[PDB]
Design a protein around this ligand. Structure first.
Ligand SMILES: CN1c2ccc(C(F)(F)F)cc2C(=O)C12CCN(CC1CCOCC1)CC2
Ligand SMILES: CN1c2ccc(C(F)(F)F)cc2C(=O)C12CCN(CC1CCOCC1)CC2
Lengths: 213, 213
């Protein structure tokens, strides 16, 4: 058909197909984020006021990845959601590819735009501030971790609930790549990893409160 | 016209007007919540493991009010949003009156239903658990306060942002009772009082973290 997105009765003008093969885009994102992850591992190795341990370093790598994604990938959507169609910039093509599992990013839905606006403006800088805090053993580190994780979980839950109440019409149900991987799995992370970071922070802050009392 | 809600080109069947005068409904809600507030004041007076102080007692009264509202008033909407029109139950009439400043509660918007579902299921019981925690000086008290306040702020911000992006079409702009009071003021509380409770909790938890370190 003219366009690949769901529902198929959509009428999208100014749709022009992605020029690059999709694996260019996907592999570029994975390569750059892997470089970011290894660089953050090294940084936590050499730039910590006191040693951190393996799993906290991995948590900082996660927070750096979240900061990059929210500031750049989602920020590009928030800036240019009106012109994702008919554009051949790298991040625009990435969004066009991703939206085949969720067409709300092409339709400019109000809830989506608002949620990604909040995510790009608040949770990205706060995710990087978490890393800065943990490097210097500042206070607020577990507080910021808890706040960011709670916000991410709330946003993802609202996202899933709204798409469910719409009947899963913005994406083909049961398609391996577009439903299970793009829509479910890549979002289920922001339900699972933040959750572990909420149970963890609560364990430490509580131990602090019992120390005062 | 047939119905009072905005936009006026809406076509609502099964609309049947409120039977009671509106001040019955408003005064009943204010009277019962005032009884709740004074009862919570007394309870914090006589049922605290250690004395709490005036402003913390007021915070507990706020949390009890939030718990009642989220569990009952918003829970009624989540349960019966399909049949608010054409019903003459007390809370149904309350919702019909309130929606004259925001018609999304009559239209059953997906974002509204999902947000109030989360609010009724999570933040109400957690708001009451905050009170129970503060009464017994359990830990988690400031953690729960922070989490509930952050969730309330996030929900209210998304609410306002979505209605703004819609152009303020679900309510008459600049009407004293329906815009400033119902829509803005009654919601601005959940931006102002939670915020003060986020700056407060951060002050205490931080002092705990500095005690461990
Ligand atoms: C569009 N986008 C992607 C596009 C492609 C790829 C891939 F396939 F290349 F791996 C990954 C992602 C992402 O991580 C996302 C960006 C980050 N959000 C996280 C949510 C934002 C709202 O709040 C809850 C969390 C999921 C999808
Ligand atoms: C409908 N409803 C009312 C109806 C009437 C009256 C009045 F006029 F009688 F005072 C008060 C209220 C409320 O408090 C509310 C219930 C509570 N929400 C709080 C938000 C819920 C979503 O997340 C952010 C906070 C505002 C309006």
């Amino acid at each position: 058909p003219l366009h690949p997105y769901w529902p198929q009765h959509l009428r999208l003008d100014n749709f022009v197909p992605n020029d690059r093969p999709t694996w260019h885009i996907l592999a570029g994102l994975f390569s750059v984020t892997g470089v970011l992850v290894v660089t953050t591992w090294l940084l936590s190795g050499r730039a910590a006021v006191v040693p951190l341990g393996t799993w906290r370093r991995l948590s900082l790598c996660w927070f750096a990845v979240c900061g990059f994604i929210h500031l750049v990938i989602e920020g590009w959507f928030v800036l240019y959601y009106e012109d994702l169609l008919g554009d051949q910039a790298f991040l625009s093509q990435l969004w066009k590819e991703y939206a085949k599992g969720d067409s709300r990013y092409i339709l400019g839905d109000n809830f989506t735009v608002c949620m990604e606006t909040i995510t790009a403006c608040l949770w990205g800088p706060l995710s990087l501030w978490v890393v800065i805090a943990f490097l210097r053993q500042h206070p607020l580190r577990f507080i910021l971790q808890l706040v960011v994780s709670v916000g991410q979980i709330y946003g993802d839950v609202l996202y899933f609930l709204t798409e469910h109440r719409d009947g899963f019409q913005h994406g083909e149900l049961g398609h391996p790549l577009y439903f299970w991987f793009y829509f479910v799995f890549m979002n289920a992370l922001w339900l699972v990893l933040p959750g572990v970071l909420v149970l963890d922070a609560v364990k430490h802050l509580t131990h602090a409160q019992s120390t005062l009392d």
